[PDB]
Amino acid sequence: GRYVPFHIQVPQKFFAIKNLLLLPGSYTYEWNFRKDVNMILQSSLGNDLR
Amino acid sequence: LYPIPAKATNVPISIPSRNWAAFRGWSFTRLKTKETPSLGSGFDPYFVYS
Amino acid sequence: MSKEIPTPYMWSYQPQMGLAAGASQDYSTRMNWLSAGPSMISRVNGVRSHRNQILLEQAAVTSTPRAKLNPRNWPSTLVYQEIPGPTTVLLPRDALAEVRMTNSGVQLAGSSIGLRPDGRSSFTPNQAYLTLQSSSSEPRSGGIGTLQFVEEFVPSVYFNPFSGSPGLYPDEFIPNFDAVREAVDGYD
Amino acid sequence: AAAAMTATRLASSYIAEEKLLALLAELEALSRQLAALTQQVSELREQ
Amino acid sequence: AAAAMTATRLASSYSSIIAEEKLLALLAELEALSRQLAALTQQVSELREQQQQQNK
Amino acid sequence: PTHDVTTDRSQRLTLRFVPVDREATTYLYKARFTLAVGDNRVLDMASTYF
Amino acid sequence: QTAVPSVTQKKFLCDRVMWRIPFSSNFMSMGALTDLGQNMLYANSAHALD
Description:
By secondary structure, chain A is largely without helices or strands. Chain A has one helix and one strand, in the order βα. By secondary structure, chain C is of the alpha+beta class. In chain C, the strands form two sheets. In chain C, strands 1-2 form a two-stranded antiparallel ribbon. Classes of the chains: A little secondary structure, C alpha+beta, D mainly alpha. β1 (30-34) of chain A pairs antiparallel with β2 (28-32) of chain F. The PDB classes it as virus. Chains A, B, F, G: Hexon protein.
């Protein structure tokens, strides 16, 4: 049904830091997510979702 | 991605001079255009597929 | 029958493989003396004879003598090896004291060398120094870098270039030559 | 508020050169078939 | 605020011919080709009616 | 093994970093963290799911 | 016994694969860096493929 709360995990895929071994320090890890409905949701019929 | 128009039969591509210092091979496949967003920018208002 | 003042052969750098890739006469820097009189030409030759004289001294002083110019692989005794000093570590914890303290109820919070002089902790006057080797297990031998390329490959003056014994022609001056096979290769 | 912020995304979403070469290719394919029509007529004459 | 920002992000948001004589020249040959194709069909058809009348 | 495969200094196992800021644009959501691996700890980068 | 003359039409069909044209002499993969990826012609000059 509609109105589905979610708790996704979304692992890290970039190749340079996919399995990097991070020595001690203080880093500023940050990223930019996509809020577009048409892109992050897969439909079956293929309908325009937006 | 090199576009190929509707009903066209050949895709002439070219590359100007370069060094192929450690080339390793090719790979190719044709993709329908409505099933491919333009990742060169942010959200694009033409991708209507889902 | 060459002129006695040949143009130097400049070597081009192939940065990836680490070896020089062919050669060619210095066709960029040239003096267009074709409009000069016989007096200036005598000076122009003196300039170009002065250039070839330097490149012979610079090659002798700097470049490493070798049987064949542009070898396909350099021995690990001629490639600049980066050798850093051994690193030392001041080991933070003590293994024995923390075991004895923890077993008694206290809960804490916050083949190189086994040197043990006498962050820190109040319940033990013991510190451990760990001196490790910081250099590679084996020296490198693939190809020369850039600071060494400019030293081993000064331009080569070629007097009377193609004269006798075609087996002695310098084939290294060909971009697509192959040393081991001794034959020009390429699919193109 | 979501109804307003989503409809903004909803409202946001909305030469013949190779046509000639495609047509020219088809004629060349067709023309080959007409060439094959020669042997069909020749074999008719026999018997 | 939503309104003002909306713009920098939205900002910067995202016819040929071929010689008419050549197409006219090409179209001329296709017309001639159709006539000859039509002409050949009549002779083949007339050939068949000849044979079936012989059987009759 | 017994000697030096584990510690006893009562340290956490699964940290959790709240975002240090955020944007929430119309079609983005940028989150900046201050991922800070402390001293005497070599974390990883493979086990860093969002 | 009352079949009709017929003409076959073969056709293959594969998905989920990307065609591959390796850049070796024999097309085999005897290493990551190809046989032609260290050929002295390609490694020491600039060409232009079409």
